[PDB]
Amino acid sequence: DSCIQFTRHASDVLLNLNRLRSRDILTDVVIVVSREQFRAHKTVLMACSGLFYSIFTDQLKCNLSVINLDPEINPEGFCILLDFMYTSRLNLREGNIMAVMATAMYLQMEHVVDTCRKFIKASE
Amino acid sequence: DSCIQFTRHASDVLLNLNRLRSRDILTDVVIVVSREQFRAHKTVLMACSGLFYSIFTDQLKCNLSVINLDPEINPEGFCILLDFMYTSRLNLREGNIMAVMATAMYLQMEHVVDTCRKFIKASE
């Protein structure tokens, strides 16, 4: 086509989606990770994670307002990844890298798994 | 903070949101523009438009599944802007620029109004 493109549009949309999440506006699911609960938008979760894409395209699970993750999933690891989904920023640290990688593998977030493997290989 | 950032994340999220829209997955509102209907996600509309941000933060309107636009709004103009919201690409042409600008003004999409004014000024 003969379209023009606004370079910052995608980033501005994501910034607004994060603002909506922070104010709990039109959030439609709560992700339970052991003792912790995280409110989010199903569409953003599906857009970032192979696991959530599978869950919310399921004819029964698409209607659930609560999703319970595997008890082996670390809440801090999940929190770091949920923040990444809404911001493009990953808070990767020596103290959390193993939990972040295991959570990214479970959530099926290939690019996060890739940078975790690379940061781990550099430290060995 | 000491975060790393994935450059393409925002663009990949928007691409997936557009794929969900094309397959009518978790769309939660229909925008009626005279004889035409457009299914969308409320969060994306709010993230792109001052008008939809106002509508869906309203305690009564947030719960509506149908929103009827002003009868002066051109459906093709709305379609071009809805595509822009989900893609960052604006199909701006001599034959549609006046309708696109009027629709962008109504929807409160300042950056679109700005490029329309600039393209119009260049042709006079």
């Binding site: 379209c3 023009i4 493109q5 606004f6 370079t7 | 690409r89 604006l90 950056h111 490029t115």
Partner: peptide, 4 residues
């Protein structure tokens, strides 16, 4: 705005 750019030509993509």
């Amino acid at each position: 705005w750019v030509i993509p």
